[PDB]
């Protein structure tokens, strides 16, 4: 299977031709090959987003609605295939990815649904005879740059709602999820966007991805990925003052409290903390539990842990856990567990790897030094803390560079407001777990996690400015030359 | 300052800077000597973060009211105030009489401004997707803002940035412009006596590229609101991305003012002539490229001349009535003669002034340019002015357009289609039909696009850049999960 | 015609079985037997709508968007069906019932987008330890009374958005256009929503209008019709205090100053001011030009009314005119003509009728005592008034009980503005049409013509309320007993 | 020496006819005031129409100044007001001191407001259009108050209406005519134009009437019982004026078994009896789980025991003081009498002495009880036992009305799940049922009313959206078609 850029309305090949064998993390089979492409193609996309920008943001909102309403019928006719390579490209189990696609069907309906009803402001002037009013333009080109943990909702969220406002897009998917990418090319071909405003360019985040962000004809860059990347990112987008959405790593806290049904807690803590062999940005990373139930929360949580079916993706829908991405991210749990040992922790559970395939490793007896209560752990390696009282746990919680999201378990609702607003993150969810989302609510970070929202109007606020207009229908008089 | 001497304002208490050093800030009128003012370093830029991180907690936890009721006493200081702030803003900073009043009476609104809308600032109830979910989204402050700010409008500025930071949550780290150091002491003296609790508000007087990069790098800084040179910008916003602290930027403009043919002639002129001129050009909203169609060009040109002629350019210490003060100093002179002496060899046509002594730098108007010129290409912060005549209103866009920067602009006409076209064409972050470039309020949102910089500042949007949307929901049921799928 | 009410999922004839013949305006010839229902029908269709309130308000928005979706596609499959009925039973030529059709889709398909987006507030509050927030509720059953002239778009346009916001509706059409409120009925009936959340009932105002108007189980009614209906509605409705939304008549001032294109000017005005036989609520009623002009113009505007095509609007899709709803309005057009002659008006064209078919009459050398200047001329008489400035053409325009909406014609941005400014209307277009409108925007006026706004979500603002929520999270001291 | 306050004016009422204002606690007589007719109403409001347009169209922040300078004057007035709070009204010194910090806190919200009511700018479905909606005021605006809390109720729809460019016509409650005297005091000493804001001093179907029916008001804001608010609904539609309704309560207090009981009944007793209970919002059904119903109950009357009834005059400490008038008495006395009658368990209080009623408290009541099928506005409270949280829902929505309400729980899914199934348009979880801030939206649903007050919701009430658009380009029209 052979894959292409999309630039101008055209699939094509890179400019030098080059191309490289994708694999699959199930097994290694060949899955594709896919263009190593470099600055010449992404600056053809960039300059054929440019020329199309014009006619794509001066049209009315309710065009760009249409051809979003048609890229949603397109999506419709191929969550099949969407399915099929999220799952033998990205390891993502039968649930996880039809999760993914549905959220993705509901993405799109949600930027289309938004489009024509983005408003500015009309204001009250200070002076006579002034019209007073804001509105909002589109910023331009914009880059969209993602990850491969959810490759398809992730892109689609930030591709969808930029459209929608009148931004044209240069994207670059993860290298390890260049077929996604295409697919969705694909589906916006098929919908007939006019040409440019939509152009795919597959190739290594520092070679494709540095042009876009240094290109002086790209206005923002919405990005996704670690928070090391998003500071070089951020760095490099000053030369041209492009401004920036970056929604980095997390090290989410879940807090059970000691008045919950124990049992439905652990059930909880075990989707949230591992879903994805917790490769989600707001997977519940770092487990507090008050000691009042902490015994019964472990063993609960071990038991159900336990019981999770780790299998090849592709067999039937029952599986629980597919393989991870890769062997570097199998390397690297290796060192949070090494890690984890060596400094005292006890495993209760798991750690036997076997190709791109890991079975959670589950640590007590840790304490803030381990290198998994310090740094973002994407991947099931996790961490239980046991804490005295809720001072106990809302220090546990903040004690992060991060910030992303987090939950608490009580039924108690002065404990669970009290911890919620102690909580130093961009997000929180009282009695759910850590990584909900919906297509409209504003998705987003504080401290290491990133800067900027996405969903709904929040990605329209991302993608526009406001611009202030007056209209004087009286003359007057002006203070120089005073002589006057 | 006959009785007290010009310090750093940290944790509640005015210091010296911990190293002692200091150095004498000058008049432009005249050179002569207005006080001593700290030169800081590092070291107390720092102490003044923590002492900013340390009030956070305590000052973004009490209600919205109680934060508004220390910016209108603030407000009632400010009045009592206002003489010295005009003293201080000609002296320190060149402005005529009408110049800093109408910057003092300004900062009283903006003050006013964010009193009023601190307990309004709104969050949003959601509805959810999902059943027996309540979903909300709240404003939380940024944390600790550092606030560094330019020489020309040293006053307003400031407190435009500053009054609006403090209403919604945030504490203060203050920087003001090396050439207006006694302004933002004054701006100290101000909150002081407003009684704001202590760390809440820090002033630090110092070198920019040692006490702002401090403040810029530094970790427990959660954003920087800046106004400068676009190149000052582009480093600052490079240095921030080391701690993911947002920025607001205001930058450069070069701001074109078009008059189209249907006009008041002489209405035009005289708007022009304000629009360009004043504050000696000195402004980042000034009509810097005048731009006029053909079949009036003529009358305008002259006219606009007829009245630069009666500008009367003075020591703004000797009565009310002076057009234009100096420039804020000697590398500014410096760089208009360049300006200047560029455009006549490249052929440009000097139709009045060009005259300069000491600080003073005379209106030098131009005609006969072309895109190549400096004056065309560069942000002219002085009173440099080129006439740009066109043959329609496409050529007006187009040369509108010309620029790296995209701040302000302005059209004069009578004609709505003209009017609305030629406002949808014009790329900048603000416009304005029938009036001068820099309009400003307190309560829009006032910023650029392109080289002018990031993100708006007024009222609610000064708002927006300091505080961030936090998403909450409440589930009432549980449920059951998809893992382990054998259960 | 199989023609009957829909109540509670199932379509039935009247209680008493009392039916009524339509016929056509056209012709005379017979279209259908509707039903003519009394109290007892109306109370039946409120009870199914109250009893089906709370499962429809409480699914997520998305539920009942997907229900207007559905809507909106059976819509779109029953298009011709529309418009033949329009046409047949309300007189409307092709390209007037084209686009009543292409605007119901857009109404449709609008609401549909807005229903998850209606968003409450979160406040700050003056106390410590307080939560305080805002929802939205819908406000209950929603009775919706509707007129002749635009009954689909109309209807829909109330219908629509009060159903996506979780009211559940009781509707009654004219009783000129039962057919229309029918085949809503059709759409909604094959779209699948739950039996009772919509209702029909085709009887006559005065009895199942006023039962509507006065039921304790009715939430709130909006209205469309005749300002003395609307104030009658409005004391009816006092006795439960249920809300009401009144969209009444109008009688809008078209100006035409002196710097304008004339001949273009001439074809706007003819337009704006006979556009379905001038039977719309914001037609252009009361012509006001300048004197510089005045005479240019009411020659070409009296040219373009002399090509007018008035013909059966079945025949072709070509004709300009069909006729008037029936013989009243006929009789109603001809006393308005015999006033304007009496007191000196100066006939130009028109005046002949036929049947229920009518020549547009156009007078000038009128004043301000004229019938046609001081009522809503729901039909095609129309004066010319000529002023000699701008001070003047507002004075005329708002010496008028009504303020509907509004136009003026010029190039100058201080002229338009000015008038635009001094008229007083609910809505105002600069060089443009008197009844521009569209799906998303506050339509309604002031004075006689009205109270409230309807269209997107100032639809939503009609049919829902406000509600302050706080949670306290500390305890305090009370003042009572102070001993204490 | 009490008068009107006309275009500028203090003048008696044109037929010179008076009478004299007596204070609840002693009968004192307090001033003579104006018994205005329909013409001295109408003389207002062709004042306020006359001065309408320039008021309007001023810039907000003019208007912000001149409420800024009200707030200047309240501030100097204070004392005088809470005086005549407590002597007119019958108020506690704690009562009318809230009321006047209240009052405060409402001036200055409309003040700092003004100038940022927003209209919207919106995408157009068509080309080369541009589509906007301004805010724009109703009018003239009349005021119609009650006589409880005659201070704060007032300059909540003055201070607001005024603000975003209405002018005002206010009639305030014939039992507190000099606290509506006292407010035109301050409002003159502001210096408004002359006919931005008159008060007409007479009696509700007169000069209130009047109010209601005339052609140039555009809008009525009225605060008082559902049966006048629905006279006032129906007479308003004949000119088609918009109304405002914040009309009576029967507010549910639902308190759950997992509470700390002995602060409940704090709460409970501060929520049903503050004012006499003479509050819109009053705790006026409490609804006790039957878990902790005995100790709630003996701690509540406890505490209920504890009330001093006295003389407000007398000093600061005094928790309650008379009801308004006579009248208000003997209704109470009627509500006593019916629950007695129909086998009610009368726990403490029911005497009265003078205008003085000592606090009735009852249980083992049903729902054929006055006290639990009307509003009832002074000190007599049932309690209710439940059995679970579906019987205090469905007790607590057992009533005509829908104002306020409360539960206390410690649990987050039974407080929110009560919130939510309560029908009633404002709902406090741990507080008080009567909880009000300056700039939230207050008002109920049923038969508490229409609309919202308060801020921009206030805001809301007294001005219209209007569309306004520009086309730019030119197009062909579809009649005549052989064009
Ligand atoms: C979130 O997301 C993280 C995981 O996703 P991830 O592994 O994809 O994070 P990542 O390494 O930061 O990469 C994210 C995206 O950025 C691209 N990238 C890498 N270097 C870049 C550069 N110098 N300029 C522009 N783009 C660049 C990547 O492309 P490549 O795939 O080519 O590296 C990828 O498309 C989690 O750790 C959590 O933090
Ligand atoms: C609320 O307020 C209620 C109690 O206060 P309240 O005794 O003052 O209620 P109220 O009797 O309804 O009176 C409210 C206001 O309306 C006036 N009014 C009475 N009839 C009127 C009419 N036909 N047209 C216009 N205005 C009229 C009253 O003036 P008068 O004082 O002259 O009657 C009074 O100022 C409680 O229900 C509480 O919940």
């Known amino acids: ?57 001066n049209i009315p909102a ?51 649904e ?82 440019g405003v939509f152009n ?45 959405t970056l929604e980095l790593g997390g090290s989410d806290p879940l807090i059970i409290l000691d008045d919950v049904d124990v049992d439905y807690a652990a059930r909880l803590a075990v989707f949230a903390s591992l879903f994805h062999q917790g490769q989600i940005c707001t997977s519940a990373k770092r487990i507090i539990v008050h000691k009042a139930v902490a015994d019964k929360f472990i063993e609960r949580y071990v038991h159900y842990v336990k019981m999770l079916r780790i299998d090849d993706p592709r067999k039937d829908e029952k599986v629980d856990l597919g393989p991870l991405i890769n062997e570097r ?27 791109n395939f890991f079975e959670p490793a589950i640590f007590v007896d840790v304490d803030r030094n381990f290198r998994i209560m310090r740094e973002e752990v994407f991947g099931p390696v996790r961490p239980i803390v046991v804490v005295e009282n809720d001072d106990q746990a809302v220090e546990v919680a903040n004690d992060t560079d991060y910030g992303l999201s987090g939950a608490v378990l009580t039924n108690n609702v002065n404990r669970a407001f009290r911890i919620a607003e102690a909580v130093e993150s961009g997000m929180f969810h009282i009695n759910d777990v850590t990584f909900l989302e919906e297509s409209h609510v504003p998705f987003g970070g504080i401290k290491a996690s990133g800067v900027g929202r996405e969903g709904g109007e929040w990605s329209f606020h991302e993608t526009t400015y406001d611009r202030w207009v007056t209209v004087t229908l009286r003359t007057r008089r002006f203070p120089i030359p005073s002589a006057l």
Chains 1, 3 share one sequence.
Request: a positive charge; glycine letters at 10%; proline letters at 4%.
């Open 1 to 57: 299977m052979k894959v292409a850029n999309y630039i101008n309305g055209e699939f094509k090949e890179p400019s030098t031709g080059a191309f490289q064998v994708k694999t699959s993390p199930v097994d290694g089979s060949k899955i594709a090959e896919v263009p190593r492409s470099g600055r010449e193609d992404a600056r053809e996309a960039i300059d054929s987003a440019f020329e199309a920008l014009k006619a794509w943001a």
């Open 62 to 112: 309710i065009r760009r609605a249409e051809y979003l309403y048609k890229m949603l019928e397109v999506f419709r006719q191929m969550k099949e295939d969407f399915m099929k390579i999220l799952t033998v490209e990205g390891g993502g189990t039968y649930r996880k990815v039809w999760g993914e696609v549905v959220f993705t069907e509901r993405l799109i309906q949600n930027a289309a």
């Open 114 to 195: 938004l489009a024509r009803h983005y408003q500015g402001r009309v204001l009250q002037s200070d002076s006579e005879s002034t019209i007073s009013v804001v509105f909002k333009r589109s910023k331009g080109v914009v880059g969209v740059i993602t990850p491969w943990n959810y490759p398809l909702s992730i892109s689609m969220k930030k591709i969808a709602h930029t459209l929608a406002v009148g931004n044209t897009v240069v994207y670059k998917p993860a290298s390890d999820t260049p077929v996604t990418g295409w697919l969705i090319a694909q589906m916006v071909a098929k919908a007939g966007l006019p040409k």
């Open 200 to 244: 795919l360019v597959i190739g290594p985040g520092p070679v494709v991805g540095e042009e876009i962000v240094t290109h002086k004809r790209v206005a923002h860059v919405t990005f996704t990925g670690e928070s090391s990347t998003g500071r070089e990112i951020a760095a490099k987008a000053a030369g041209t003052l492009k401004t920036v």
């Open 329 to 355: 991210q199998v390397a690297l749990m290796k060192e949070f567990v090494d890690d984890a040992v060596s400094r005292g922790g006890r495993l209760l559970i798991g750690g036997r790897s076997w190709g």
